[PDB]
Amino acid sequence: MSVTLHTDVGDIKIEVFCERTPKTCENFLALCASNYYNGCIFHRNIKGFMVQTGDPTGTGRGGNSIWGKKFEDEYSEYLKHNVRGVVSMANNGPNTNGSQFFITYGKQPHLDMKYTVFGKVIDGLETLDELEKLPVNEKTYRPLNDVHIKDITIHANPFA
């Protein structure tokens, strides 16, 4: 239920909410566990708004769920883009969730009920600061230099 993203500019620990968003959880974890994200870049980085990643093709149009078919949204009145560091699934319309996800840089209430929030950054906030600071192509918002997710670590919760 906890994950760490090992990026080129630091580590970012994300806590996932499996109980509220179980399908989004299972998917995210399956992809992390199967090295799907290893190597992805952050293709869209919009200061004061959010950073996006999870697209193996790095174009912003690729990526797919562990099922190979987009799944449904899992909204919750409890989960909202109201604090900096909220993690959600990107989509191109209702129920078109694949593998891309993004991290907010601050409150973005106009995203609630449109994107599935499934996690939060609980450690590595300075890394978020690094990311938001990267120079981008003013027209496409793609960083001048590629920033990848090197590896991912899934924190096992004492059991087995």
PDB file of C-alpha atoms in Angstrom:
ATOM      1  CA  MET A   1       0.000   0.000   0.000  1.00  0.00           C
ATOM      2  CA  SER A   2       3.102   2.197  -0.183  1.00  0.00           C
ATOM      3  CA  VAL A   3       5.418   2.857  -3.122  1.00  0.00           C
ATOM      4  CA  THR A   4       8.608   4.793  -3.802  1.00  0.00           C
ATOM      5  CA  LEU A   5       9.448   6.265  -7.188  1.00  0.00           C
ATOM      6  CA  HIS A   6      13.189   6.385  -7.833  1.00  0.00           C
ATOM      7  CA  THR A   7      13.558   9.302 -10.233  1.00  0.00           C
ATOM      8  CA  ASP A   8      16.630  10.987 -11.712  1.00  0.00           C
ATOM      9  CA  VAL A   9      16.146  13.911  -9.322  1.00  0.00           C
ATOM     10  CA  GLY A  10      15.235  12.129  -6.111  1.00  0.00           C
ATOM     11  CA  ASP A  11      12.812   9.761  -4.453  1.00  0.00           C
ATOM     12  CA  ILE A  12       9.062  10.188  -4.084  1.00  0.00           C
ATOM     13  CA  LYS A  13       7.110   8.014  -1.685  1.00  0.00           C
ATOM     14  CA  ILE A  14       3.448   7.574  -2.539  1.00  0.00           C
ATOM     15  CA  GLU A  15       0.791   6.010  -0.330  1.00  0.00           C
ATOM     16  CA  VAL A  16      -1.988   4.329  -2.331  1.00  0.00           C
ATOM     17  CA  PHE A  17      -5.587   4.026  -1.108  1.00  0.00           C
ATOM     18  CA  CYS A  18      -6.517   0.456  -2.010  1.00  0.00           C
ATOM     19  CA  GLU A  19      -9.632   0.485   0.181  1.00  0.00           C
ATOM     20  CA  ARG A  20     -11.346   3.377  -1.608  1.00  0.00           C
ATOM     21  CA  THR A  21     -10.034   2.739  -5.113  1.00  0.00           C
ATOM     22  CA  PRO A  22      -9.338  -1.031  -5.325  1.00  0.00           C
ATOM     23  CA  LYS A  23      -9.223  -1.451  -9.111  1.00  0.00           C
ATOM     24  CA  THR A  24      -6.980   1.599  -9.598  1.00  0.00           C
ATOM     25  CA  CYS A  25      -4.853   0.211  -6.773  1.00  0.00           C
ATOM     26  CA  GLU A  26      -4.476  -3.290  -8.155  1.00  0.00           C
ATOM     27  CA  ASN A  27      -3.598  -1.879 -11.556  1.00  0.00           C
ATOM     28  CA  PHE A  28      -1.033   0.629 -10.350  1.00  0.00           C
ATOM     29  CA  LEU A  29       0.630  -1.969  -8.160  1.00  0.00           C
ATOM     30  CA  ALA A  30       0.636  -4.638 -10.889  1.00  0.00           C
ATOM     31  CA  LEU A  31       2.391  -2.251 -13.272  1.00  0.00           C
ATOM     32  CA  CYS A  32       4.909  -1.150 -10.631  1.00  0.00           C
ATOM     33  CA  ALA A  33       5.614  -4.776  -9.681  1.00  0.00           C
ATOM     34  CA  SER A  34       6.077  -5.833 -13.325  1.00  0.00           C
ATOM     35  CA  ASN A  35       8.621  -3.091 -14.149  1.00  0.00           C
ATOM     36  CA  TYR A  36       6.195  -1.403 -16.529  1.00  0.00           C
ATOM     37  CA  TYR A  37       7.093   2.098 -15.377  1.00  0.00           C
ATOM     38  CA  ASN A  38      10.850   1.599 -15.242  1.00  0.00           C
ATOM     39  CA  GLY A  39      12.287   4.011 -17.786  1.00  0.00           C
ATOM     40  CA  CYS A  40       9.315   6.361 -18.243  1.00  0.00           C
ATOM     41  CA  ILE A  41       9.939  10.088 -18.423  1.00  0.00           C
ATOM     42  CA  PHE A  42       7.799  12.889 -17.064  1.00  0.00           C
ATOM     43  CA  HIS A  43       6.462  14.116 -20.399  1.00  0.00           C
ATOM     44  CA  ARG A  44       4.285  17.026 -19.283  1.00  0.00           C
ATOM     45  CA  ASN A  45       5.409  19.295 -16.459  1.00  0.00           C
ATOM     46  CA  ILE A  46       3.221  22.306 -15.688  1.00  0.00           C
ATOM     47  CA  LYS A  47       4.440  24.435 -12.762  1.00  0.00           C
ATOM     48  CA  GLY A  48       1.889  25.308 -10.106  1.00  0.00           C
ATOM     49  CA  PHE A  49      -0.367  22.701 -11.709  1.00  0.00           C
ATOM     50  CA  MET A  50       0.986  19.136 -12.035  1.00  0.00           C
ATOM     51  CA  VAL A  51       3.573  16.699 -13.468  1.00  0.00           C
ATOM     52  CA  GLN A  52       2.542  13.780 -15.654  1.00  0.00           C
ATOM     53  CA  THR A  53       4.138  10.404 -16.415  1.00  0.00           C
ATOM     54  CA  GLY A  54       3.425   6.704 -16.961  1.00  0.00           C
ATOM     55  CA  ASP A  55       3.530   6.693 -20.778  1.00  0.00           C
ATOM     56  CA  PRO A  56       6.089   4.145 -22.102  1.00  0.00           C
ATOM     57  CA  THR A  57       6.028   5.887 -25.497  1.00  0.00           C
ATOM     58  CA  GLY A  58       6.619   9.278 -23.891  1.00  0.00           C
ATOM     59  CA  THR A  59       4.197  10.987 -26.260  1.00  0.00           C
ATOM     60  CA  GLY A  60       1.295  11.315 -23.864  1.00  0.00           C
ATOM     61  CA  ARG A  61      -0.946   9.040 -25.938  1.00  0.00           C
ATOM     62  CA  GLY A  62       0.426   5.643 -24.927  1.00  0.00           C
ATOM     63  CA  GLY A  63       0.268   3.240 -22.015  1.00  0.00           C
ATOM     64  CA  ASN A  64      -2.376   0.775 -20.894  1.00  0.00           C
ATOM     65  CA  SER A  65      -3.670  -1.011 -17.798  1.00  0.00           C
ATOM     66  CA  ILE A  66      -2.375  -4.386 -16.671  1.00  0.00           C
ATOM     67  CA  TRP A  67      -5.464  -5.698 -18.455  1.00  0.00           C
ATOM     68  CA  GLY A  68      -4.693  -4.167 -21.834  1.00  0.00           C
ATOM     69  CA  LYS A  69      -8.060  -2.413 -21.775  1.00  0.00           C
ATOM     70  CA  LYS A  70      -8.973   0.896 -20.159  1.00  0.00           C
ATOM     71  CA  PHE A  71     -10.852   0.499 -16.885  1.00  0.00           C
ATOM     72  CA  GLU A  72     -13.521   2.504 -15.065  1.00  0.00           C
ATOM     73  CA  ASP A  73     -13.134   5.504 -12.774  1.00  0.00           C
ATOM     74  CA  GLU A  74     -13.346   5.125  -9.007  1.00  0.00           C
ATOM     75  CA  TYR A  75     -14.385   8.509  -7.637  1.00  0.00           C
ATOM     76  CA  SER A  76     -14.779   9.115  -3.910  1.00  0.00           C
ATOM     77  CA  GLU A  77     -16.147  12.047  -1.926  1.00  0.00           C
ATOM     78  CA  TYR A  78     -13.253  11.441   0.447  1.00  0.00           C
ATOM     79  CA  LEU A  79     -10.480  11.844  -2.120  1.00  0.00           C
ATOM     80  CA  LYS A  80      -9.994  15.286  -3.662  1.00  0.00           C
ATOM     81  CA  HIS A  81      -7.261  17.287  -5.405  1.00  0.00           C
ATOM     82  CA  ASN A  82      -7.147  19.718  -2.486  1.00  0.00           C
ATOM     83  CA  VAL A  83      -3.572  19.494  -1.268  1.00  0.00           C
ATOM     84  CA  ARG A  84      -0.190  19.560  -3.007  1.00  0.00           C
ATOM     85  CA  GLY A  85       1.099  16.116  -3.909  1.00  0.00           C
ATOM     86  CA  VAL A  86      -2.154  14.298  -4.683  1.00  0.00           C
ATOM     87  CA  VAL A  87      -1.682  11.417  -7.141  1.00  0.00           C
ATOM     88  CA  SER A  88      -4.344  10.577  -9.737  1.00  0.00           C
ATOM     89  CA  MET A  89      -4.909   8.661 -12.957  1.00  0.00           C
ATOM     90  CA  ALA A  90      -4.853  10.597 -16.209  1.00  0.00           C
ATOM     91  CA  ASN A  91      -7.626   9.913 -18.726  1.00  0.00           C
ATOM     92  CA  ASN A  92      -9.145  11.210 -21.942  1.00  0.00           C
ATOM     93  CA  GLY A  93     -12.754  11.116 -20.827  1.00  0.00           C
ATOM     94  CA  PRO A  94     -14.739   8.955 -18.373  1.00  0.00           C
ATOM     95  CA  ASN A  95     -13.561   5.360 -17.924  1.00  0.00           C
ATOM     96  CA  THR A  96     -10.464   5.500 -20.119  1.00  0.00           C
ATOM     97  CA  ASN A  97      -7.838   4.723 -17.475  1.00  0.00           C
ATOM     98  CA  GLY A  98      -4.641   3.099 -18.705  1.00  0.00           C
ATOM     99  CA  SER A  99      -1.239   3.578 -17.088  1.00  0.00           C
ATOM    100  CA  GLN A 100      -0.576   7.324 -17.148  1.00  0.00           C
ATOM    101  CA  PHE A 101      -0.951   9.205 -13.864  1.00  0.00           C
ATOM    102  CA  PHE A 102       0.028  12.630 -12.562  1.00  0.00           C
ATOM    103  CA  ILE A 103       0.961  14.439  -9.362  1.00  0.00           C
ATOM    104  CA  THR A 104      -0.550  17.822  -8.463  1.00  0.00           C
ATOM    105  CA  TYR A 105       1.558  20.795  -7.362  1.00  0.00           C
ATOM    106  CA  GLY A 106      -1.295  22.242  -5.357  1.00  0.00           C
ATOM    107  CA  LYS A 107      -5.041  22.528  -4.827  1.00  0.00           C
ATOM    108  CA  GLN A 108      -6.915  21.894  -8.111  1.00  0.00           C
ATOM    109  CA  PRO A 109     -10.621  21.540  -7.184  1.00  0.00           C
ATOM    110  CA  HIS A 110     -11.637  21.669 -10.856  1.00  0.00           C
ATOM    111  CA  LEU A 111     -10.210  18.143 -11.235  1.00  0.00           C
ATOM    112  CA  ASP A 112     -12.423  16.494  -8.618  1.00  0.00           C
ATOM    113  CA  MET A 113     -14.921  13.972 -10.000  1.00  0.00           C
ATOM    114  CA  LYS A 114     -13.117  13.996 -13.352  1.00  0.00           C
ATOM    115  CA  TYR A 115      -9.925  12.147 -12.427  1.00  0.00           C
ATOM    116  CA  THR A 116      -9.486   9.159 -10.144  1.00  0.00           C
ATOM    117  CA  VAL A 117      -7.417  10.115  -7.120  1.00  0.00           C
ATOM    118  CA  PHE A 118      -5.672   7.026  -5.770  1.00  0.00           C
ATOM    119  CA  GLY A 119      -2.754   8.212  -3.693  1.00  0.00           C
ATOM    120  CA  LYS A 120      -0.702  10.879  -1.975  1.00  0.00           C
ATOM    121  CA  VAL A 121       2.944  11.871  -1.596  1.00  0.00           C
ATOM    122  CA  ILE A 122       3.959  11.272   2.013  1.00  0.00           C
ATOM    123  CA  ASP A 123       7.713  11.715   1.713  1.00  0.00           C
ATOM    124  CA  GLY A 124      10.080  13.169  -0.852  1.00  0.00           C
ATOM    125  CA  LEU A 125       8.299  16.517  -1.136  1.00  0.00           C
ATOM    126  CA  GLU A 126      11.579  18.244  -1.944  1.00  0.00           C
ATOM    127  CA  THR A 127      11.772  15.990  -5.013  1.00  0.00           C
ATOM    128  CA  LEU A 128       8.411  17.376  -6.040  1.00  0.00           C
ATOM    129  CA  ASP A 129       9.982  20.806  -5.662  1.00  0.00           C
ATOM    130  CA  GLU A 130      12.834  19.758  -7.932  1.00  0.00           C
ATOM    131  CA  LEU A 131      10.433  18.522 -10.601  1.00  0.00           C
ATOM    132  CA  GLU A 132       8.303  21.666 -10.568  1.00  0.00           C
ATOM    133  CA  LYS A 133      11.476  23.688 -11.074  1.00  0.00           C
ATOM    134  CA  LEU A 134      12.663  21.958 -14.243  1.00  0.00           C
ATOM    135  CA  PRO A 135      12.856  24.096 -17.425  1.00  0.00           C
ATOM    136  CA  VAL A 136      10.319  23.075 -20.037  1.00  0.00           C
ATOM    137  CA  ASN A 137       9.435  23.740 -23.643  1.00  0.00           C
ATOM    138  CA  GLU A 138       7.011  26.643 -23.166  1.00  0.00           C
ATOM    139  CA  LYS A 139       4.816  25.271 -25.975  1.00  0.00           C
ATOM    140  CA  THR A 140       4.481  21.588 -25.081  1.00  0.00           C
ATOM    141  CA  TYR A 141       5.483  21.655 -21.404  1.00  0.00           C
ATOM    142  CA  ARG A 142       7.965  18.880 -21.970  1.00  0.00           C
ATOM    143  CA  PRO A 143      11.178  19.273 -19.919  1.00  0.00           C
ATOM    144  CA  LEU A 144      14.234  20.311 -21.923  1.00  0.00           C
ATOM    145  CA  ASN A 145      16.026  17.360 -20.367  1.00  0.00           C
ATOM    146  CA  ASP A 146      14.470  13.926 -19.879  1.00  0.00           C
ATOM    147  CA  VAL A 147      13.695  12.957 -16.294  1.00  0.00           C
ATOM    148  CA  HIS A 148      13.031   9.256 -15.865  1.00  0.00           C
ATOM    149  CA  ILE A 149      11.710   6.965 -13.199  1.00  0.00           C
ATOM    150  CA  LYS A 150      14.706   4.658 -12.848  1.00  0.00           C
ATOM    151  CA  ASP A 151      13.132   2.013 -10.668  1.00  0.00           C
ATOM    152  CA  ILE A 152      10.222   1.594  -8.263  1.00  0.00           C
ATOM    153  CA  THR A 153      10.127   0.050  -4.807  1.00  0.00           C
ATOM    154  CA  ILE A 154       6.985  -1.511  -3.350  1.00  0.00           C
ATOM    155  CA  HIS A 155       7.030  -1.277   0.436  1.00  0.00           C
ATOM    156  CA  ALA A 156       5.761  -4.551   1.870  1.00  0.00           C
ATOM    157  CA  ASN A 157       3.578  -4.186   4.954  1.00  0.00           C
ATOM    158  CA  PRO A 158       4.642  -6.603   7.765  1.00  0.00           C
ATOM    159  CA  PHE A 159       2.768  -9.871   7.143  1.00  0.00           C
ATOM    160  CA  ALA A 160       4.201 -12.228   4.490  1.00  0.00           C
TER     161      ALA A 160
END
